[PDB]
Design a protein around this ligand. Structure first.
Ligand SMILES: COc1cc2c(cc1OC)[C@H](c1cccnc1)N(C(=O)c1ccc(O)cc1O)CC2
Ligand SMILES: CC(C)c1ccc(COc2ccc(CC(=O)NCCN)cc2Cl)cc1
Ligand SMILES: [Mg+2]
Length: 337
């Protein structure tokens, strides 16, 4: 096989950050453009991250968990080679490719629980010192980011080439609606496991159009994933702090739209978290026993971020920061150096 020389040639190239605007303009600006493009860009982004995997020490590199995904990436890389020589125009050369993408998405579905079981066997084999933390944390933020960037291209392709929504993108994303959806769903999960559930106050704030409901251009899939996780905590927290009590304070969410920042605060009153312990809530390692950090990545992905400020003995605040503009909204891709 040539896979390591393939990795070699394509780890030369750089991932190409796309905007929302570009993602949309594919709308269709046609399959053949999407094909000719992706059959370069995927290899590039696969190659790039696979080059980084290979830079891990043998004590990590050797472990079952790693080699397994390292394998998947190869099998995937290879699958996309097949289409380098093939010319578009042929409606069947395009068809077989879409299939190829689907099979690859579905091959990679377990990356998360898998990487986890590698972390875990590391903590027990080698230990949980802070330096191990920074390394794991450095790498996985990048790995998992890279991972997201790839899913994004793949869904974009398959969902279009099978109109209001444009694949995983809503150009008219009513944010509050997504917020209810994530809440309702969390409420369901909460009630089920707890027989109660704090209510939800939402309040919009439209800087410019002081009155108008807040539409934005996003991948609502991603926005849900994040909101959902945040609620899960806001509820778990709110409940356990007040199980000996009667009255269950709601979960206030605020949505602010400014000149560039669309911000979402999820205030709970769950007896909060002392500052010392906050960094840890984003640590892949220090939260492996046998969430947020991934939700954080999803934010950073289109140039946003996700922060916690709690007040030990009151409650936590959790802000999702999104760029307000299709123009300022570009992929954050981990890149080689
Ligand atoms: C590891 O130590 C701790 C972690 C967390 C909390 C407290 C911790 O020790 C004191 C805190 C909490 C847990 C249970 C009940 N009430 C609050 N959390 C929060 O306040 C919280 C965290 C995240 C979030 O999105 C919302 C929250 O309310 C949970 C974590
Ligand atoms: C399972 C996955 C997520 C995993 C588990 C564990 C790790 C641990 O990563 C470490 C820990 C220590 C060192 C010291 C060193 O030798 N530095 C030289 C490197 N330049 C390097 C690395 Cl890459 C990474 C990834
Ligand atoms: Mg923070």
């Amino acid at each position: 096989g040539s896979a390591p020389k393939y990795i070699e040639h394509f780890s030369k190239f750089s991932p190409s950050p796309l905007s929302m605007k570009q993602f949309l303009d594919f709308g269709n600006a046609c399959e053949k453009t999407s094909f000719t493009f992706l059959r370069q860009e995927l290899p590039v982004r696969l190659a790039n991250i696979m080059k980084e995997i290979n830079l891990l020490p043998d004590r990590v590199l050797s472990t079952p968990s790693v080699q397994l995904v390292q394998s998947w990436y190869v099998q995937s890389l290879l699958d996309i080679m097949e289409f380098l020589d093939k010319d578009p125009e042929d409606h069947r050369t395009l068809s077989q490719f879409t299939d190829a993408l689907v099979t690859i998405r579905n091959r990679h579905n377990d990356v998360v629980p898998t990487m986890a079981q590698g972390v875990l066997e590391y903590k027990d084999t080698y230990g949980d010192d802070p330096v191990s933390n920074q390394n794991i944390q450095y790498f996985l933020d990048r790995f998992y980011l890279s991972r997201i960037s790839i899913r994004m291209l793949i869904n974009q392709h398959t969902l279009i080439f099978d109109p209001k929504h444009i694949g995983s993108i809503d150009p008219n994303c009513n944010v509050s609606e997504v917020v209810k959806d994530a809440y309702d769903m969390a409420k369901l999960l909460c009630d089920k496991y707890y027989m109660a559930s704090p209510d939800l106050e939402i309040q919009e704030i439209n800087a410019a159009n002081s009155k108008q409901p807040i539409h934005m251009v996003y991948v609502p899939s991603h926005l849900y994933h994040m909101l959902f996780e945040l609620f899960k905590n806001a509820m778990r927290a709110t409940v356990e702090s007040h199980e000996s009590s009667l009255i269950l304070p709601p979960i206030k969410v605020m949505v602010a739209l400014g000149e560039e920042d669309l911000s979402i605060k999820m205030s709970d009153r769950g007896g909060g978290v002392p500052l010392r312990k906050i960094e840890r809530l984003f640590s892949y390692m220090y939260s492996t026993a046998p969430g947020l950090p991934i939700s954080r990545l999803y934010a950073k992905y289109f140039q946003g971020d996700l922060q916690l400020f709690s007040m030990e003995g009151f409650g936590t605040d959790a802000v999702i920061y999104l760029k307000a503009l299709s123009t300022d909204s570009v992929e954050r891709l981990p890149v080689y150096n």
